[PDB]
Amino acid sequence: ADSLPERIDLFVSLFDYNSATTSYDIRSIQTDFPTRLLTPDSMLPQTSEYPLKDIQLLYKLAQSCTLSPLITEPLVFTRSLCKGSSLSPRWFARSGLIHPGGGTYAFRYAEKYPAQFANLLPYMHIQERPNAAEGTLLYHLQNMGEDAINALVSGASMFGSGSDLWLRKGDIYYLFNEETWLTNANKAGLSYSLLSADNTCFIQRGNICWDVE
Amino acid sequence: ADSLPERIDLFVSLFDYNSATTSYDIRSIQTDFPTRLLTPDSMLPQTSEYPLKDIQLLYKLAQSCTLSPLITEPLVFTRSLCKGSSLSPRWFARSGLIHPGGGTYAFRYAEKYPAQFANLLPYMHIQERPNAAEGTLLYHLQNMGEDAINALVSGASMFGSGSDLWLRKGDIYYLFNEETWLTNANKAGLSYSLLSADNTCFIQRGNICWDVE
Numbered sequence: 001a002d003s004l005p006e007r008i009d010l011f012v013s014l015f016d017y018n019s020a021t022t023s024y025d026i027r028s029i030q031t032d033f034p035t036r037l038l039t040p041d042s043m044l045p046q047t048s049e050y051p052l053k054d055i056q057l058l059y060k061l062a063q064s065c066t067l068s069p070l071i072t073e074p075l076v077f078t079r080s081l082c083k084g085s086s087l088s089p090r091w092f093a094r095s096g097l098i099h100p101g102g103g104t105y106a107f108r109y110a111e112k113y114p115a116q117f118a119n120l121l122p123y124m125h126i127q128e129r130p131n132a133a134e135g136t137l138l139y140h141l142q143n144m145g146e147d148a149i150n151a152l153v154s155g156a157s158m159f160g161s162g163s164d165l166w167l168r169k170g171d172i173y174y175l176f177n178e179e180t181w182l183t184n185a186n187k188a189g190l191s192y193s194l195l196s197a198d199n200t201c202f203i204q205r206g207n208i209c210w211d212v213e
Numbered sequence: 214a215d216s217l218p219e220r221i222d223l224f225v226s227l228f229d230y231n232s233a234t235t236s237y238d239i240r241s242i243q244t245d246f247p248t249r250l251l252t253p254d255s256m257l258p259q260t261s262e263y264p265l266k267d268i269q270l271l272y273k274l275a276q277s278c279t280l281s282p283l284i285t286e287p288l289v290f291t292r293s294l295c296k297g298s299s300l301s302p303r304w305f306a307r308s309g310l311i312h313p314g315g316g317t318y319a320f321r322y323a324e325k326y327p328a329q330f331a332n333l334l335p336y337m338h339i340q341e342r343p344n345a346a347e348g349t350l351l352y353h354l355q356n357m358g359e360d361a362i363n364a365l366v367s368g369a370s371m372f373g374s375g376s377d378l379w380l381r382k383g384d385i386y387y388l389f390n391e392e393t394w395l396t397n398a399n400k401a402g403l404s405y406s407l408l409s410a411d412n413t414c415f416i417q418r419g420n421i422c423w424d425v426e
């Protein structure tokens with residue numbers, strides 16, 4: 001197992017970057033996609049960011065339409081929706097993007113004002129945008145699980161999503177299909193699997209890898 | 214991660230053995246199924262047991278029907294097939310079971326003498342037997358991958374096959390479905406995954422666990 005780092009280096013050396021399925025500049029991804037609009041936790045009620053009773057207070061208000069400083073901006077949003085007052089794309093660009101109840105301000109607003117949808121897409125979570133065309137960047141992002149999104153955001157040297165290997169060289173991710181990945185792992189004398197969070201198979205029982213959650 | 218053994222113990226304690234999907238006595242399994250007829254390697258040409266040129270010599274003979282002491286029994290089998298001489302179920306019970314070219318003597322023999330099929334089933338590899346009825350022991354065995362078969366043969370305290378947890382208590386395996394497994398792992402504060410051989414995720418890169426093959 002001491003040869004492992006050297007085998008992984010050999011593995012990477014086997015790839016022909018010119019024959020990658022596609023490639024994406026990390027800078028282009030960062031330009032187009034706020035991390036806040038990638039991470040799956042943004043889609044959930046923001047319980048780690050607010051006391052629950054404040055989130056509940058906002059729902060009550062939005063349903064009733066008739067107040068701590070943790071929620072100043074959510075309150076501005078809520079009142080605007082209640083009053084039928086308009087919010088320009090500039091308001092969303094200035095905003096924290098994520099509504100305390102989960103998802104974005106832009107998506108909620110555009111549901112009420114569908115004519116403003118196109119201009120507000122840049123401020124919506126990838127999971128809130130329409131299903132992307134196959135093979136596009138947004139498609140790849142929409143189909144990534146949490147661990148893959150985290151790896152991408154971390155600028156990891158490599159990660160797997162959905163039988164695609166994403167390989168980083170310089171500032172560019174090159175995508176290779178599962179067959180190529182497996183072929184090169186085989187040649188390097190390597191086995192691989194995808195594991196979640198920091199699950200390192202700390203203890204093994206039979207064929208089951210266990211870790212603490 | 215020091216709490217891990219204690220969490221696994223708690224995990225096991227959560228199962229109600231009386232409400233298991235099914236259960237199998239390990240002794241019953243050993244009685245019915247020779248390990249040789251379970252392990253997937255028995256289905257492959259026996260390259261670790263014979264020089265390849267001896268295996269090839271046998272094929273030539275079986276095709277021609279006209280000789281080291283590593284292959285004395287395979288030669289007896291081959292000549293019997295060529296001569297149309299018969300081999301009783303007692304011959305197979307006395308035999309090493311596995312043909313050098315892979316699979317069993319019994320399966321090959323029964324292909325030539327289909328009337329003798331039923332009496333020769335006990336000497337055929339599980340992968341050579343007809344697809345078993347759903348829910349039966351043979352069905353579960355036929356659907357196990359290599360790591361699961363090895364765990365079972367090892368009498369492991371627990372292993373997963375196909376979204377079934379096999380839990381050993383005393384000499385009995387109790388089967389629980391994936392939902393129960395996940396529910397109890399969740400409660401114990403545990404994460405789990407199935408990994409092959411002794412792949413322990415020795416090195417992690419992005420979300421990829423790497424080990425030496």
